[PDB]
Nucleic acid binder design. Structure first.
Ligand SMILES: Cc1cnc(N)c2[nH]cnc12
Length: 231
DNA sequence: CCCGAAGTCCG
DNA sequence: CGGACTTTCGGG
């Protein structure tokens, strides 16, 4: 079965504009886990738009197929484009897509893909269907996969007043002893972000519960100005 | 335009 | 460990 024509067209058009000189530092930035074509976001967005203009966005029946096929291509720009495409199908994504999103998280995994899946796509799903959180979060925390653990921490990133504080702090407590940078830093980020909404709760939490030094320092980067640094 | 959100280098 | 500094991206 041939590659979906939309994917083939995107592959041809991106490849015709590759920049091997830029690809080298771009690949190093992601610690050489991926090949890059060397196309930065502004041009990558225009090249995708070119293909949508010519071919039209595929029928929704092929949404998951297109994303998978792009996920399977070697160069990282194809996963970035896949996430751009998934946003275009946003109004068609719902709770039945959680496993599909899980599988994207755990394949071709790094912060650049995971952080564009979790707080937006999964965040929106669990905001509408909070009763489904306990069908996934416990498994994610218990798994060997650091990106699922990071997903458990960051899905509520943007919740603001809708943050489930007890849940957030329970998740952090489960993962606070992790030596993994991407876990320590995710804890730092979610606390720093939630502190923009409820600084007193975050301050009390970090002063009275164990965290990796990195996590605590990142959490209070801004709010330490409000409370002061005791001698 | 601005600001706030991985990476290297150094003590 | 953590400060100083870097580019790229998204949002205001
Ligand atoms: C995630 C992140 C944080 N801070 C910066 N100064 C960055 N520059 C590029 N990504 C960044």
């Amino acid at each position: 079965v041939p590659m979906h024509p939309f994917v083939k067209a995107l592959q041809e058009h991106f490849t015709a504009h590759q920049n091997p000189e830029k690809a080298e530092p771009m690949a190093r930035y992601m610690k050489n886990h991926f090949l890059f074509l060397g196309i930065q976001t502004p041009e990558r967005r225009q090249l995708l738009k070119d293909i949508i203009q010519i071919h039209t966005l595929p029928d929704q029946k092929d949404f998951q197929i297109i994303i998978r096929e792009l996920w399977d291509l070697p160069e990282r720009e194809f996963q970035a484009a896949a996430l751009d495409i998934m946003q275009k199908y946003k109004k068609h994504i719902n709770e039945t897509h959680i496993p599909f999103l899980e599988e994207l998280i755990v394949t071709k995994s790094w912060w650049d893909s995971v952080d564009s899946i979790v707080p937006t796509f999964l965040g929106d799903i669990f905001l509408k269907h909070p009763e489904l959180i306990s069908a996934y979060i416990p498994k994610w925390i218990a798994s060997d996969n650091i990106w699922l653990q990071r997903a458990a921490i960051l899905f509520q990133l943007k919740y603001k007043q809708k943050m489930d504080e007890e849940l957030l702090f329970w998740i952090i407590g489960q993962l606070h002893s992790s030596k993994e940078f991407f876990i320590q830093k995710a804890i730092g980020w979610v606390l720093r972000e939630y502190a923009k909404t409820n600084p007193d709760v975050v301050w009390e939490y970090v002063q009275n519960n164990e965290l990796a030094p990195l996590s605590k320092r990142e959490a209070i980067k801004h709010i330490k100005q409000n409370y002061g640094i005791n001698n």
